[PDB]
Amino acid sequence: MQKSNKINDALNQHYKLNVELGLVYAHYAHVADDEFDMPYLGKFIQHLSEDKLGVHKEYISDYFKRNGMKLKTDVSVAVKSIPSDAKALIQEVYARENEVRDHVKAIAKLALAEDDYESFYFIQWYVRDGLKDLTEVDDVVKLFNSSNDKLIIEETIKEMVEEHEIWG
Amino acid sequence: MQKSNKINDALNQHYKLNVELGLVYAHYAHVADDEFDMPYLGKFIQHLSEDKLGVHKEYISDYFKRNGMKLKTDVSVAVKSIPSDAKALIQEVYARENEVRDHVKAIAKLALAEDDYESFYFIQWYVRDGLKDLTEVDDVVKLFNSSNDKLIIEETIKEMVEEHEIWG
Amino acid sequence: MQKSNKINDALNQHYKLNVELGLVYAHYAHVADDEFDMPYLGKFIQHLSEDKLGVHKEYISDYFKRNGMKLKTDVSVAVKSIPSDAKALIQEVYARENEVRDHVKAIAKLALAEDDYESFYFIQWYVRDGLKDLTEVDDVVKLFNSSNDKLIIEETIKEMVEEHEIWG
Amino acid sequence: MQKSNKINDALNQHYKLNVELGLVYAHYAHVADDEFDMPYLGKFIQHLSEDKLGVHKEYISDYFKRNGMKLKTDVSVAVKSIPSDAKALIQEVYARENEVRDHVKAIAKLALAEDDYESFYFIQWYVRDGLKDLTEVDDVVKLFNSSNDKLIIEETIKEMVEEHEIWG
Amino acid sequence: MQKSNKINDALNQHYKLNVELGLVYAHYAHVADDEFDMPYLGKFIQHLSEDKLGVHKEYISDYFKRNGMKLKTDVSVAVKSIPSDAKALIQEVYARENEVRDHVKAIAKLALAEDDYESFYFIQWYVRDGLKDLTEVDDVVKLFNSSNDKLIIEETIKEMVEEHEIWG
Amino acid sequence: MQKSNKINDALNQHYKLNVELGLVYAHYAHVADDEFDMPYLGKFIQHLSEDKLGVHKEYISDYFKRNGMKLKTDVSVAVKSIPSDAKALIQEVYARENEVRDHVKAIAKLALAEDDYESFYFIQWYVRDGLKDLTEVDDVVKLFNSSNDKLIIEETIKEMVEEHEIWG
Ligand SMILES: [Cl-]
Ligand SMILES: [Cl-]
Ligand SMILES: [Cl-]
Ligand SMILES: [Cl-]
Ligand SMILES: [Cl-]
Ligand SMILES: [Cl-]
Ligand SMILES: [Cl-]
Ligand SMILES: [Cl-]
Ligand SMILES: [Cl-]
Ligand SMILES: [Cl-]
Ligand SMILES: [Cl-]
Ligand SMILES: [Cl-]
Ligand SMILES: [Cl-]
Ligand SMILES: [Cl-]
Ligand SMILES: [Cl-]
Ligand SMILES: [Cl-]
Ligand SMILES: [Cl-]
Ligand SMILES: [Cl-]
Ligand SMILES: [Cl-]
Ligand SMILES: [Cl-]
Ligand SMILES: [Cl-]
Ligand SMILES: [Cl-]
Ligand SMILES: [Cl-]
Ligand SMILES: [Cl-]
Ligand SMILES: [Fe+3]
Ligand SMILES: [Fe+3]
Ligand SMILES: [Fe+3]
Ligand SMILES: [Fe+3]
Ligand SMILES: [Fe+3]
Ligand SMILES: [Fe+3]
Ligand SMILES: [Fe+3]
Ligand SMILES: [Fe+3]
Ligand SMILES: [Fe+3]
Ligand SMILES: [Fe+3]
Ligand SMILES: [Fe+3]
Ligand SMILES: [Fe+3]
Ligand SMILES: [Fe+3]
Ligand SMILES: [Fe+3]
Ligand SMILES: [Fe+3]
Ligand SMILES: [Fe+3]
Ligand SMILES: [Fe+3]
Ligand SMILES: [Fe+3]
Ligand SMILES: [Fe+3]
Ligand SMILES: [Fe+3]
Ligand SMILES: [Fe+3]
Ligand SMILES: [Fe+3]
Ligand SMILES: [Fe+3]
Ligand SMILES: [Fe+3]
Ligand SMILES: [Fe+3]
Ligand SMILES: [Fe+3]
Ligand SMILES: [Fe+3]
Ligand SMILES: [Fe+3]
Ligand SMILES: [Fe+3]
Ligand SMILES: [Fe+3]
Ligand SMILES: [Fe+3]
Ligand SMILES: [Fe+3]
Ligand SMILES: [Fe+3]
Ligand SMILES: [Fe+3]
Ligand SMILES: [Fe+3]
Ligand SMILES: [Fe+3]
Ligand SMILES: [Fe+3]
Ligand SMILES: [Fe+3]
Ligand SMILES: [Fe+3]
Ligand SMILES: [Fe+3]
Ligand SMILES: [Fe+3]
Ligand SMILES: [Fe+3]
Ligand SMILES: [Fe+3]
Ligand SMILES: [Fe+3]
Ligand SMILES: [Fe+3]
Ligand SMILES: [Fe+3]
Ligand SMILES: [Fe+3]
Ligand SMILES: [Fe+3]
Ligand SMILES: [Fe+3]
Ligand SMILES: [Fe+3]
Ligand SMILES: [Fe+3]
Ligand SMILES: [Fe+3]
Ligand SMILES: [Fe+3]
Ligand SMILES: [Fe+3]
Ligand SMILES: [Fe+3]
Ligand SMILES: [Fe+3]
Ligand SMILES: [Fe+3]
Ligand SMILES: [Fe+3]
Ligand SMILES: [Fe+3]
Ligand SMILES: [Fe+3]
Ligand SMILES: [Mg+2]
Ligand SMILES: [Mg+2]
Ligand SMILES: [Mg+2]
Ligand SMILES: [Mg+2]
Ligand SMILES: [Mg+2]
Ligand SMILES: [Mg+2]
């Protein structure tokens, strides 16, 4: 029952992505409220920041404790440019969440290639959450194409931040 | 009522410290439970990680929204070596918390030098919390000098993780 | 423990400002609802009027009772011109609240220059409230730049008038 | 249904009286507790200050919103001399409240002279309150003629500040 | 983050003052009830004795535990003369409480001179309480100038011994 | 029914002992937690400090009020040396409590020699409490001879600080 080093590597990479994405999202949330005058969009992005810097990373660490895998902490992130407006901020978040889905697929494929069924089981959570988080972000992006009034959008977002049988 | 760039710089530096310290503490918490077989010490360090990556950073961002100061996100951290044992892990945390106190003092001094009384008010929270957090860490360090049995220490720590009128 | 006459003067000046600002705000609230057809903006300005003519002045009087300082009542205010629209009404309120912050800073500086630490303690409330009140006003100003529909703005304001750990 | 300019003038004058009387009463309340060592008399005068700077002025503004009358804000008040003792302080309040009654009578007379029955209806509140407020003040004045002991008077006043079918 | 020896000295001095003042107040409370036949005045002075020998001293000790400062216990007090009457007993208490305020100011000044912002934070409690305790004592002193009947005064004091947003 | 001057003297001496012992115990409690890293032992000694500086002294003062005896306040205490360890700290407390018992016996003997049966009745409380307090202290001393692990002792003490039909 020796741990897979490839899976160990891939999951340390996912830990990093989650840490760094959450830090970018914290800045993006600040910018939503401060510069773009959209506090509820900020609360949405802040809640996603906390999701990435919380359970998304913690489950990897917990799993590692259980199987012998080593946790690595190497984090480098800088927000050097901000999107121009709020539509583009949420569109950037979307693209980053679609990339999460790609990364998770690769891990699942690797687990099966490695006959690591515990790792294939563990990553099902992230397979499901990849679509859940993408859908939540997609719901907000759409509002920017349904209304040209920031305060309507803001009112719709505040009802969003106030489980599906499959997608959680 | 123009914002101080020195104070802006100093507080962006404190944001970074908090982010990075919290990430080191997350790794240290993992190591406490996994390698040093001390789960309750890990819960203590995890709760401190979440304090640093939460309110400690968020208050700076909130303050910036209110005053015009710019938030910067530039984070670089790597855990390249781990302390040898649990005593030394909590002693490293202590040293890092004593350095927090030094950094906070400098900000308070600067605020007064700048006649930025809103910033002197805002940092009182961190002045107080510098001693509070240091004391919490100090209480754990002491246990390692009061007992040579990991499980006694663990039992004492679990009652610690289950407000002072001045120190919060 | 003799009272500072400079601090006495400065705080009698702050009492006057608060009385007079509250009276201007009462008129401005009336104008918001009557002429600009924005009743919820009026309730916001009325609540700020009552804040200025209440606790803001009362705490100064209470403090004076406790320390020997003399209260002076000399009030002169006339609303001779009204802003053209609602955006400009809330922008005028903003400017007047930013000036409050300047005045409070001066008092805090003076207290420290005078070694009047009771007065430096007493004014911390106003240091904090200077930013709190400015932020509340800033939140409303922003709405006028996020929507060109008075009734959307009105709906957003009514959820605002229906404590932060630092800013109160 | 065009608004009466005479009634508009008279009611803007009553608004001013109420604002200014309330400000004098706030100072007088401070003096009662601080200099005359009578805190409960101060609470009585403070409650009358808040009555004058609250409902007494607000109803005029509300009425104006409803009928087209213009609100004017021109306030000038200075407390340049204080009565010598507490008896005389409450006797001054009395005289000022008896003058309120005269002013209200004039408004009622004018409304009838103008065939402004909405204004005659609106001022009935102030006709009634003119006697109510005068009676409350009269009850306190009497105590100063019933006892030569400040603390007896104070004890009687504190039970006063802890509706008649006609007088409200 | 080395502790200030001057601040250590000054706070050991404040500990002593509090211990000794509380012991004088215990005797003074006894004298109020026994010799001056004023039991409620005694309960007031006893509650102040317990305040000085409790939180006032304990917070200093707690603070010392947290920062490395050394507690010293050197106490010398003797009540060799008693004031002649009750008015003078409460007037002596007043003078001793006004001196507390002077001593606390000096500590705050020293903390700022020393750039000891933790100590400046810790002493804010005592800055505030210096005025609070003085005001409580002042309220009783006044009664002796408002009535020449011990039992009226006693009745007023018993309602006093049966938080302000700023002064606690 | 004239009061005994010998009993008056002896009870003024017991008042002094209680005041001074309580002050030594407050320092000893501080040392237990700070230097000896034993917070629960400190809470035990702090509770004994408060017992001595509270009821133990107050009952003497109350008794004096009732019988004509004069209270004297002459207090001199300095903690010039601290015991080396925690065992010795609690052993010093023990010795001081055994001496309390001797002193109380003398008072009881004197009361009977003086035919002061009210004083013999009053001191029964202290006769009983002499053994009660000694037993409480004895229970802690024993722990230091039952375990060589500070944290076991600490855990046992914390269940002690979380009435016998005879001994109270
Ligand atoms: Cl870079
Ligand atoms: Cl935007
Ligand atoms: Cl995409
Ligand atoms: Cl693969
Ligand atoms: Cl590296
Ligand atoms: Cl270990
Ligand atoms: Cl260190
Ligand atoms: Cl500086
Ligand atoms: Cl004018
Ligand atoms: Cl408008
Ligand atoms: Cl402005
Ligand atoms: Cl200045
Ligand atoms: Cl004038
Ligand atoms: Cl008077
Ligand atoms: Cl009259
Ligand atoms: Cl007429
Ligand atoms: Cl002497
Ligand atoms: Cl007397
Ligand atoms: Cl004095
Ligand atoms: Cl100094
Ligand atoms: Cl000595
Ligand atoms: Cl020890
Ligand atoms: Cl012994
Ligand atoms: Cl004998
Ligand atoms: Fe906001
Ligand atoms: Fe969610
Ligand atoms: Fe765009
Ligand atoms: Fe998620
Ligand atoms: Fe809605
Ligand atoms: Fe809803
Ligand atoms: Fe809702
Ligand atoms: Fe809804
Ligand atoms: Fe809704
Ligand atoms: Fe709903
Ligand atoms: Fe576990
Ligand atoms: Fe905590
Ligand atoms: Fe070691
Ligand atoms: Fe903290
Ligand atoms: Fe246990
Ligand atoms: Fe427990
Ligand atoms: Fe438990
Ligand atoms: Fe327990
Ligand atoms: Fe337990
Ligand atoms: Fe418990
Ligand atoms: Fe309306
Ligand atoms: Fe408010
Ligand atoms: Fe405009
Ligand atoms: Fe305010
Ligand atoms: Fe709505
Ligand atoms: Fe709502
Ligand atoms: Fe609602
Ligand atoms: Fe709603
Ligand atoms: Fe709604
Ligand atoms: Fe709501
Ligand atoms: Fe008062
Ligand atoms: Fe009333
Ligand atoms: Fe007179
Ligand atoms: Fe009225
Ligand atoms: Fe009564
Ligand atoms: Fe009653
Ligand atoms: Fe009552
Ligand atoms: Fe009653
Ligand atoms: Fe009563
Ligand atoms: Fe009653
Ligand atoms: Fe009694
Ligand atoms: Fe109190
Ligand atoms: Fe006298
Ligand atoms: Fe106090
Ligand atoms: Fe009564
Ligand atoms: Fe009562
Ligand atoms: Fe009562
Ligand atoms: Fe009562
Ligand atoms: Fe009563
Ligand atoms: Fe009551
Ligand atoms: Fe502790
Ligand atoms: Fe006990
Ligand atoms: Fe030993
Ligand atoms: Fe006892
Ligand atoms: Fe236990
Ligand atoms: Fe238990
Ligand atoms: Fe328990
Ligand atoms: Fe238990
Ligand atoms: Fe237990
Ligand atoms: Fe139990
Ligand atoms: Mg295969
Ligand atoms: Mg300067
Ligand atoms: Mg200076
Ligand atoms: Mg007619
Ligand atoms: Mg300096
Ligand atoms: Mg015999």
What's CA A117's distance to the chain center, in Å? 24
> What single DSSP character describes residue B2?
P
Is C43 within 8 Å of D8 (Cβ atoms)? no
Compute the Cα dihedral for F159, F161, F163, F168 and give only its sign: positive
Write out the two tokens for C38.
């924005």
Angle CA(F124)–CA(F130)–CA(F133) in degrees, nearest 5?
135
Distance of alpha carbon E47 from alpha carbon D150, whole angstroms: 26
Residues 6+ apart with CB under 8 A from D55: none
H or E element that contains B74: strand B74-78
Distance of alpha carbon F101 from alpha carbon F12, whole angstroms: 16
- D31-46 burial, b if ≥16 CB within 10 A, otherwise e? bbbbebbbbbbbbbbb
Distance of alpha carbon A49 from alpha carbon A77, whole angstroms: 14
Is residue D78 classed as helix, strand or coil in its secondary structure?
A: strand
Compute the Cα dihedral for B63, B69, B71, B74 and give only its sign: negative
Distance of alpha carbon D109 from alpha carbon C98, whole angstroms: 46
H or E element that contains C109: helix C86-113
* A78 phi, psi to nearest 5 deg: -140, 135
Distance of alpha carbon A92 from alpha carbon A104, whole angstroms: 19
Strands (E) across D11-136 are located at 74-78
The answer to whether E150 contacts chain F (CB < 8 Å) is: no
Compute the Cα dihedral for C109, C115, C117, C118 and give only its sign: negative
Distance of alpha carbon F105 from alpha carbon A88, whole angstroms: 87
Name the amino acid, one letter, at E67.
Answer: N
Place of tokens 């901000």: A82
Distance of alpha carbon A119 from alpha carbon A10, whole angstroms: 11
Is D50 within 8 Å of D103 (Cβ atoms)? no
Is B119 within 8 Å of B4 (Cβ atoms)? yes
- E119-132 burial, b if ≥16 CB within 10 A, otherwise e? bbbbbbbbbbbbbb
Is C130 within 8 Å of C111 (Cβ atoms)? no
Rg for chain D, CA atoms, rounded: 17
Is residue B41 classed as helix, strand or coil in its secondary structure?
A: helix
Distance of alpha carbon E156 from alpha carbon D149, whole angstroms: 12
Residue F64 CA neighbour count, 13 Å, CB half: 26
**Can you give the length of chain A in residues?**
168
Residue E77 pairs in a beta bridge with: F75
| CA D72 – ligand 16 centroid, Å | 21
Q: Which residues from C are below 8 Å from D34, CB to CB?
A: 64-65
Query: Which residue pairs from E10-13 have beta carbons closer than 8 angstroms and sit at least 24 positions apart in sequence?
Result: E10/E106, E10/E107, E10/E110, E11/E60, E11/E63, E11/E64, E11/E69, E11/E107, E11/E119, E12/E60, E12/E70, E12/E71, E12/E72, E13/E103
Residue D81 CA neighbour count, 13 Å, CB half: 4
Instruction: Say if residue D84 is exposed, middle or buried (CB neighbours under 10 Å; 0-12, 13-18, 19+).
Output: exposed
Can you give the resolution of this entry in Å? 2.5
Residues 6+ apart with CB under 8 A from A160: A44, A136, A139, A140
The answer to whether E1 contacts chain B (CB < 8 Å) is: yes
Neighbours of ion ligand 38 (CB under 5 A): B 51, 129, 133
Closest CB to F75: pick one of E23, E30, E33.
Answer: E23
Name the amino acid, one letter, at D95.
Answer: A
Q: Which residues from D are below 8 Å from E155, CB to CB?
A: 151, 155
Is F124 within 8 Å of F105 (Cβ atoms)? no
Compute the Cα dihedral for C90, C91, C96, C101 and give only its sign: positive
Distance of alpha carbon D116 from alpha carbon D10, whole angstroms: 13
> What single DSSP character describes residue B144?
H
Nearest CA to F65 out of E48, E38, E21 is that of E38
Q: What is the DSSP code string of D88-100?
A: HHHHHHHHHHHHH
The answer to whether C72 contacts chain D (CB < 8 Å) is: yes
Q: At what angle do helices F5-34 and E55-67 cross, to 10 degrees?
A: 30
Is residue C4 classed as helix, strand or coil in its secondary structure?
A: coil
Place of tokens 């039991």: E39
Distance of alpha carbon E41 from alpha carbon B120, whole angstroms: 41
Residues 6+ apart with CB under 8 A from C99: none
Write out the two tokens for D115.
């065939």
Max Cα-Cα span within chain D: 57
Instruction: Say if residue C48 is exposed, middle or buried (CB neighbours under 10 Å; 0-12, 13-18, 19+).
Output: buried
Residue E75 pairs in a beta bridge with: F77
| CA E155 – ligand 72 centroid, Å | 9
Is residue A26 classed as helix, strand or coil in its secondary structure?
A: helix
> What single DSSP character describes residue D85?
S
Return the residue in B152, B159, B160 with the most chain F beta carbons within 10 A, the one to mutate for interface testing.
B152
CB contact under 8 A, C67 and E167: no
Distance of alpha carbon D136 from alpha carbon D51, whole angstroms: 13
| DSSP β-ladder status, C74-78 and A74-78 | unpaired
Is D76 within 8 Å of D49 (Cβ atoms)? no
Indicate the Cα dihedral angle D75, D76, D77, D80, nearest 10°: 170
Return the residue in A67, A75, A79, A80 with the most chain B beta carbons within 10 A, the one to mutate for interface testing.
A75
Is E118 within 8 Å of B131 (Cβ atoms)? yes
Write out the two tokens for B151.
């499980």
Q: At what angle do helices A86-113 and A117-146 cross, to 10 degrees?
A: 160
| DSSP β-ladder status, E74-78 and F74-78 | antiparallel
Place of tokens 């020796």: A2
Is E18 within 8 Å of E57 (Cβ atoms)? yes
Q: Please indicate the experimental technique that yielded this structure.
A: X-ray
